[PDB]
Design a protein around this ligand. Structure first.
Ligand SMILES: [Cl-]
Length: 407
């Protein structure tokens, strides 16, 4: 009694996603961004497509490059992707990893000198995520050892054992900082959904390759924290910021984070095999997906950016909520069998192809205005890597593969 798109549509979508990933996204990243002056990858590519090999380089961006090429190599086998992942890994271990205090710096100069040595848990998480993926792709001993060491440092220096969750930022020597903001956009609050979501993402990937008993407990605790404190059943949205006891300190809504968490939370419970927790997670996941469907979309099926603290709807289409909606809506279809979620995934894909991707300049525009005008944002910067859209394509390809095997 399944309602399933026919084989032609499934395969056509899967082929388009594969083409987008390999002939647009990963081609852009492998050709435009490697830096032969300092090694590794440039920190910025302007709106005109010009790379900036002297720009400062973010740990999150470089972890995202490593993760994406590692994952693409694992799933597709293309040798260039292993080469690019190795390139990212080598620069990462050389320069971003703090050999003295452990963990990864926030920002290095292009030549590798530390510039911002804070140890932000969000960056530590992306390091774990990328290093565990590189281990998954290669069996790399050192990659896994490094991921485990960063996990240990997060638990040792940042875990709030009274209230759950984590202090989100420390200085180089792991002393907590008051200002845990990722950027000026973020509320000056001690706890954020965003950082905790990516701890969960990292821990789930680490557990997949290293099923340590204590890590399972920490990951389950994070799932339970989302269910009890962050997910808001009255509205179907994640609460974004909190004090240390998880009292809400924001009313903003992030549609992209809702739909990302919708599928990441289920990936996390399934990595654990926690069948007892899964019904509650699936319920919250489907709720987040329905709330996104009903409240976060433009009539073309693309996702708006946010409802701000004053209630203003930011109608800009940022690139990464569209990517996360592609995966999250496909995932919601897989979980519920409700083909309306597949229709929604198809609609966001069509928007990605017709508006968000930059056919002339390559990759995807960071932002498209409500009237269709692409903003002249950088194509690559501290916050724009290949991970959201690369992962989204890889996820969709594999999910469509599974759906194709239902026949
Ligand atoms: Cl990204």
């Amino acid at each position: 009694t399944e309602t399933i798109p026919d084989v032609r549509r499934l395969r056509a979508l899967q082929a388009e996603v594969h083409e987008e990933l390999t002939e647009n996204i990963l081609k852009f990243w492998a050709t435009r961004t490697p830096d032969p002056v300092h090694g590794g990858f440039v920190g910025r590519v302007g709106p005109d497509g010009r790379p900036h090999p002297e720009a400062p380089r973010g740990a999150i961006l470089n972890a995202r490059i490593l993760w994406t090429f590692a994952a693409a190599y694992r799933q597709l086998g293309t040798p260039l992707y292993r080469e690019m992942a190795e390139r990212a890994y080598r620069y990462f271990v050389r320069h971003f990893v703090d050999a003295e205090h452990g963990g990864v710096y926030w920002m290095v100069a292009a030549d590798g000198r530390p510039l911002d040595t804070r140890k932000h848990v969000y960056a530590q998480s992306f390091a774990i995520y990328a290093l565990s993926e590189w281990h998954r792709a290669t069996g790399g001993e050192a990659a896994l050892a490094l991921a485990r060491s960063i996990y240990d440092l997060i638990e040792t220096h940042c875990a709030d054992r009274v209230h759950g969750g984590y202090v989100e930022a420390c200085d180089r020597a792991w002393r907590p900082l008051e200002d845990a903001r990722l950027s000026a956009k973020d509320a000056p609050e001690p706890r954020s959904m965003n950082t905790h979501l990516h701890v969960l993402e990292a821990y789930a990937n680490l557990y997949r390759v290293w099923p340590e008993t204590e890590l399972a407990a920490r990951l389950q605790a994070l799932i339970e924290l989302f269910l009890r404190a962050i997910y808001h059943p009255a509205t179907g949205h994640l609460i974004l910021f909190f004090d240390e006891r998880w009292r809400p300190r924001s009313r903003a809504v992030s549609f992209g984070h809702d739909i990302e968490a919708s599928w990441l939370l289920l990936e996390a419970v399934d990595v654990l095999g926690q069948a007892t927790l899964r019904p509650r997670v699936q319920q919250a996941s489907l709720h987040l997906a329905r709330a996104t469907l009903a409240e976060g979309r433009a009539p073309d099926g693309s996702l708006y950016y946010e409802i701000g603290e004053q209630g203003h709807l930011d109608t800009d289409r940022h690139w990464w909520p569209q990517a996360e909606a592609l995966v999250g809506f496909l995932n919601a279809y897989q979980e519920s069998g409700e083909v309306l979620f597949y229709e929604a995934a198809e609609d966001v894909w069509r928007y990605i192809r017709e508006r968000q991707r930059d056919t002339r300049g390559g990759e995807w525009f960071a932002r498209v205005r409500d009237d269709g005008a692409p903003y002249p944002d950088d194509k690559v910067d501290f916050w724009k890597g290949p991970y959201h859209n690369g992962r989204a394509c890889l996820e969709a390809i594999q999910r469509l593969r599974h759906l194709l095997e239902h026949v």
